Amino acid sequence: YIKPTKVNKNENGVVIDDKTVLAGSTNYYELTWDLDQYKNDRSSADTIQKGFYYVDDYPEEALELRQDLVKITDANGNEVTGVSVDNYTSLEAAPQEIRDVLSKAGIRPKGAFQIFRADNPREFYDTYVKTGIDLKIVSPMVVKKQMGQTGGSYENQAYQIDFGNGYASNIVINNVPKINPKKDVTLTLDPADTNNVDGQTIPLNTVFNYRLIGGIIPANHSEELFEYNFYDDYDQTGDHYTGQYKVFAKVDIILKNGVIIKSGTELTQYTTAEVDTTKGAITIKFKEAFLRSVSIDSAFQAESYIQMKRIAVGTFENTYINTVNGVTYSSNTVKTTT
Ligand SMILES: [Ca+2]
Ligand SMILES: [Ca+2]
């Protein structure tokens, strides 16, 4: 059976079809150009001249192209030359040549799409088609930051067009988690206590905590965590950072080696803090090697407690930024009175 096939992979070449993919992650889409049914073909010149194209109809509202990382290899491992790639923002913008090929093949891409085109049909034919050598196209596409603000699902589909005939690939679907960091104000540490004093008043010179709750990274995700930070530029005219902070697991976490770390476990040992005393700021950073030791199948979430002393009267606000794999996500803003 002639079948162009499409599979999504992470940067380590693991298959990630149906996995949760974080904003900022790359989909290393691998497109198969299925030519193995044409072995020994001996078509006319007119027929060969109808050309060979491949189409990827990618979801442009969710993903951005990484053009430069596009690679085409033949089944014998030779890199493929003679195939050029063009990205079109809409059908309306494609040349007539392209609109006609697509129309006569019964292919109508939704929104934006890529075309891979054999520059010389005769030569492409003689090289890969009459010999039935399948090609592999890798066309990496990054999930836009915005998908991480809204959550959502996206799908990708390809077509191959041989002698002007179109064949559709399977459709690959993934989804993106809405990362929503939260910020509470608490009077005690101890994660079990759900008390939140956002809005209330704090007596002058009270030692308290800002509770910085990280975004939830769901199980079955597509790549390794390498960064998970809590950045807090607090108002030092109101709040004095006391130099004390702790970090806790907020869901059960499973490592690559099978070791489990229960929700509530203190994770401070796997962190450092970058402190900027003049600016009045602190960044709590998970060590990259710890994050990377976590299984891609595991859920992951953590929360930091920074200990503050209220040192003046007035109304003071605070906000923090949770940075996950290079993408920033802001929390709500708390406000207390003194
Ligand atoms: Ca599209
Ligand atoms: Ca500050």
Residue numbers in the entry: 1152 to 1489
Manuscript text:
The final model of SpaP-C1136–1489 from S. mutans consists of six independent protein chains, each binding to two Ca2+ ions. In each β-­sandwich the two sheets are linked by a covalent isopeptide bond formed between the side chains of a lysine and an asparagine. In the C2 β-sandwich an isopeptide bond is formed between Lys1157 of one sheet and Asn1307 of the other. Similarly, an iso­peptide bond is formed between Lys1334 and Asn1469 of the C3 β-­sandwich. The Ca2+ ion in the C2 domain is coordinated by carboxylate groups from two residues, Asp1208 and Glu1211, the carbonyl O atoms of Lys1261, Tyr1209 and Ala1263 and one water molecule. In C3 the Ca2+ ion is coordinated by side-chain O atoms from Glu1387 and Asp1384, the main-chain O atoms of Lys1430, Gly1431 and Tyr1385 and one water molecule. The overall structure of S. mutans SpaP-C is generally very similar to the structure of S. gordonii SspB-C, with the isopeptide bonds and Ca2+ atoms in identical positions.
SpaP is a 1500-residue adhesin expressed on the surface of the caries-implicated bacterium Streptococcus mutans. SpaP is a member of the antigen I/II (AgI/II) family of proteins that are expressed on the surfaces of oral streptococci and are key molecules for networking with other microorganisms and host cells in the oral biofilm. The structure of AgI/II proteins is unique in the sense that the proline-rich region and the alanine-rich region wrap around each other, forming an elongated fibrillar structure that presents the variable domain at the tip. The structure further consists of a C-terminal domain which contains an LPXTG motif that anchors the protein to the cell wall.
